[PDB]
């Protein structure tokens, strides 16, 4: 249990933020490999 | 008598440990680089050989002086001597 | 002479409350590492804390009533 627990979060929602900070501390050379993974392409369709 | 005792330590420093820098003393600084530790060496037997840059004979003379100076005050109390000499 | 044996045993009994001073330390000590994992505090953590406190007291207080019994 931590602060991300007992407030209504998930471990993916933990793992998204702490991995995003590593992609901001990279240099200009290895910024394209942070652009490579960057997995925001799946759309969301719920019928209601 | 103040310039008498002050010129004792400034003679027993700059000879046998350790003769510092600040030019007007630059070649006087390397005079301690060879050191008079070779002069100070022969008193013990040979064994304190590590005096090269951590200098034993520079320091271990003051602490040998402060022991025999404090042996005098204790002498009155711990007499113990008979009407003779020891072994 | 009667006061000689009375005034020692009243002090000799109240070393019995020292052992209650030891066992009362763990009960507010283990609850620190007990609650630190699991923040469900308003439930039966504290209710098991107060029962643990007032039970070690009753092995310290019970000698103290016997300690005043020696004097009177």
């Amino acid at each position: 249990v931590a602060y991300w627990r007992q407030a209504g979060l998930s471990y993916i929602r933990y793992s998204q933020i702490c991995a995003k900070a590593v992609r901001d501390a990279l240099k200009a050379e290895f910024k394209a490999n942070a652009e490579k993974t960057s997995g925001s392409n799946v759309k969301i369709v719920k019928v209601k | 008598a103040s310039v008498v005792p002050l010129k004792d330590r400034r003679l027993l420093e700059v000879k046998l440990g350790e003769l510092p820098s600040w030019i007007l003393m630059r070649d006087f600084t390397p005079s301690g680089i060879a050191g008079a530790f070779q002069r100070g060496y022969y008193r013990y037997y040979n064994k304190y050989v590590n005096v090269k840059k951590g200098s034993v004979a520079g320091l271990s003379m003051v602490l040998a002086a402060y022991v025999v100076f404090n042996y005098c005050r204790s002498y009155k109390e711990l007499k113990h001597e008979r009407l003779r000499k020891y072994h | 002479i009667d006061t000689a044996a009375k005034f020692i045993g009243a002090g000799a009994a109240t070393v019995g409350v020292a052992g209650s001073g030891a066992g009362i330390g763990t009960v507010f000590g283990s609850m620190i590492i007990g609650y630190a994992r699991n923040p469900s505090l308003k439930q039966q953590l504290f209710s098991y804390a107060i029962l643990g406190f007032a039970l070690s007291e009753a092995m310290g207080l019970f000698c103290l009533m016997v300690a005043f019994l020696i004097l009177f």
Binding site: - | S21, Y66, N70, Y71 | -
Partner: protein
Amino acid sequence: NENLFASFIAPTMMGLPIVTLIIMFPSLLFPTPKRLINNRTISIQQWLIQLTSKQMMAIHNQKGQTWSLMLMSLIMFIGSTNILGLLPHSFTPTTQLSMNLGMAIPLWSATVFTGFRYKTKTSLAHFLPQGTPALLIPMLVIIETISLFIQPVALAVRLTANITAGHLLIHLIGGATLALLNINTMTAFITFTILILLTILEFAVALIQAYVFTLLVSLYLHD
């Protein structure tokens, strides 16, 4: 009935010879050079300060850092005057209980008057620990104030009482060697106990960390 220990009955004397020479003497063991490169015996004294000036600096991190250039002078004096006395017939000024009651109280009361000249309310409103429950206000502020005035006595008496306690086991284990004209096998084992105990009595450096540091915590907490 093989190995009978002996004892000798003799008074153990903390006399008081001429002190104001003995206090000044561990100042002249440390020189100070007016040069850029130094002479390889001050240079390992100058390095030894730049370690432990970086541990009584790191906690405070305030404008109470001005005080910390004194606290490294306090560590070299009783760091030296506890280490000189291990010699054969030397005399330590921190054996007597007199000066340690003059090392605690002008330093300890220099701390409670530090916040009272700037804060004036919340220095001893540190007596209020938390989000106040009802049944234990009088049980608290008679406790946390009786453990405040203990601190000058708690700071000085812990230094005098164990320093002299080192010196008696030096004598008594040592004096039992001299009076051991019985069986000669056990003489070495008491001697080997001594030369272990003299290594433990270089915790007279270790007991100066526990005097400057609980002066910092007794400074950091108030300020």
